Model the fold of this input.
Amino acid sequence: RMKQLEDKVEELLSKNYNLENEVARLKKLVG
Amino acid sequence: RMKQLEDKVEELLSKNYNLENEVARLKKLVG
Done:
């Protein structure tokens, strides 16, 4: 369960980097 | 450290929900 929690942190960080990359692409379209 | 890992999961999920809400607002502007 240490490892499962660590795995979930790594997974959520990857998801937020994808969301960050998407926000930047959309902001480039608006801006 | 169990608690610290759990805290980090909860924090990253809140960040991704904010990013999700931002993506939806920007997509509403484009769409």
User: Anything to note?
Assistant: Residues 5 and 11 of chain B are 10 Å apart (CA to CA).
